[PDB]
Design a protein around this ligand. Structure first.
Ligand SMILES: [Ca+2]
Ligand SMILES: [Ca+2]
Ligand SMILES: [Ca+2]
Ligand SMILES: [Ca+2]
Ligand SMILES: [Ca+2]
Ligand SMILES: [Cl-]
Lengths: 25, 25, 25, 25
């Protein structure tokens, strides 16, 4: 388990990557 | 809970994203 | 130990960096 | 505490930011 802050940051980070890929495609 | 180093890095990461968005807007 | 979500995000983050470096080189 | 993998990724992430800032400056 992790700090809820870290879990939040991890989710935001992944979604940021996915949005960037979809934008490029 | 997480390592204080990881908590620190998560905070820096989020603030980096927010500053980038505000700069673009 | 960390949340499996955070572990996943950390792996994705590193691989993203490695791919970017290899692309530049 | 966090997974050693996550600790590693956090350190790499911060150093990446610092190097980028120093490069820009
Ligand atoms: Ca933990
Ligand atoms: Ca806490
Ligand atoms: Ca420690
Ligand atoms: Ca969980
Ligand atoms: Ca482990
Ligand atoms: Cl963690």
């Amino acid at each position: 388990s992790s700090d809820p802050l870290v879990v939040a940051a991890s989710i935001i980070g992944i979604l940021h990557l996915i949005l960037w890929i979809l934008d490029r495609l």
